């Protein structure tokens, strides 16, 4: 599941989308689109 709202992203369990900008590494464990 893609976490663009900034939901806690998993280290192995690929959550964030692909083409989506929602990043989880750059920011906290949470995955959210890059401002």
UniProtKB/Swiss-Prot annotation:
GO molecular function (one): ion channel inhibitor activity
Effect of residue 35 to A: Small decrease in ability to inhibit both Nav1.2/SCN2A and Nav1.7/SCN9A
Cystine crosslinks: 2-17, 9-24, 16-31
Impact upon substituting residue 32 to A: Almost complete loss in ability to inhibit both Nav1.2/SCN2A and Nav1.7/SCN9A
Post-translational modification: Two forms of huwentoxin-IV exist in the venom of H.schmidti, a non-N-terminally modified (HwTx-IV) and a naturally modified peptide with pyroglutamic acid residue at position 53 (mHwTx-IV). mHwTx-IV shows no observable difference with the unmodified toxin when applied to the TTX-S sodium channel of DRG neuron (IC(50)~50 nM) or when tested on hNav1.7/SCN9A (IC(50)=30.8 nM). In addition, similarly to the unmodified toxin, mHwTx-IV has only a weak affinity for lipid membranes.
Location of the protein in the cell: Secreted
Binds to the extracellular loop of voltage sensor domain II of sodium channels (Nav1.2/SCN2A and Nav1.7/SCN9A) (site feature) positions: 6, 26-27, 30, 32
UniProt-reported outcome of changing residue 1 to A: 2.8-fold increase in ability to inhibit hNav1.7/SCN9A, and no change in activity on hNav1.5/SCN5A
GO cellular component, one term: host cell presynaptic membrane
Entry keywords, A to Z: Amidation, Disulfide bond, Ion channel impairing toxin, Knottin, Neurotoxin, Presynaptic neurotoxin, Pyrrolidone carboxylic acid, Secreted, Signal, Toxin, Voltage-gated sodium channel impairing toxin
Phenotype when changing residue 33 to W: 12-fold increase in ability to inhibit hNav1.7/SCN9A, and no change in activity on hNav1.5/SCN5A. In m3-huwentoxin-IV; 43-fold increase in ability to inhibit hNav1.7/SCN9A
Further facts: Shows a weak or no inhibition on rNav1.4/SCN4A (IC(50)=3.9->10 uM) and hNav1.5/SCN5A sodium channels (IC(50)=>10-25 uM). This toxin has also been shown to weakly inhibit Kv11.1/KCNH2/ERG1, Kv1.2/KCNA2 and Kv1.3/KCNA3.
Annotated domain remarks: The presence of a 'disulfide through disulfide knot' structurally defines this protein as a knottin.
Biological role: This lethal neurotoxin (without cyclization at position 53) inhibits neuronal voltage-gated sodium channel Nav1.2/SCN2A (IC(50)=10-150 nM), rNav1.3/SCN3A (IC(50)=338 nM), Nav1.6/SCN8A (IC(50)=117 nM), and hNav1.7/SCN9A (IC(50)=9.6-33 nM). It inhibits activation of sodium channel by trapping the voltage sensor of domain II (DIIS4) in the closed configuration. The toxin neither shifts the Nav1.7/SCN9A activation curve nor modifies the slope factor. It does not slow fast-inactivation of hNav1.7/SCN9A channels. In addition, it has only a weak affinity for lipid membranes.
Family, as annotated: Belongs to the neurotoxin 10 (Hwtx-1) family. 22 (Htx-4) subfamily.
Protein name per its UniProtKB record: Huwentoxin-IV
Upper lineage: Eukaryota, Metazoa, Ecdysozoa, Arthropoda, Chelicerata
């Amino acid at each position: 599941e893609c976490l663009e709202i900034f939901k806690a992203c998993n280290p192995s369990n690929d959550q964030c989308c692909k083409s989506s900008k929602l990043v989880c590494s750059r920011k906290t464990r949470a995955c959210k689109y890059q401002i």
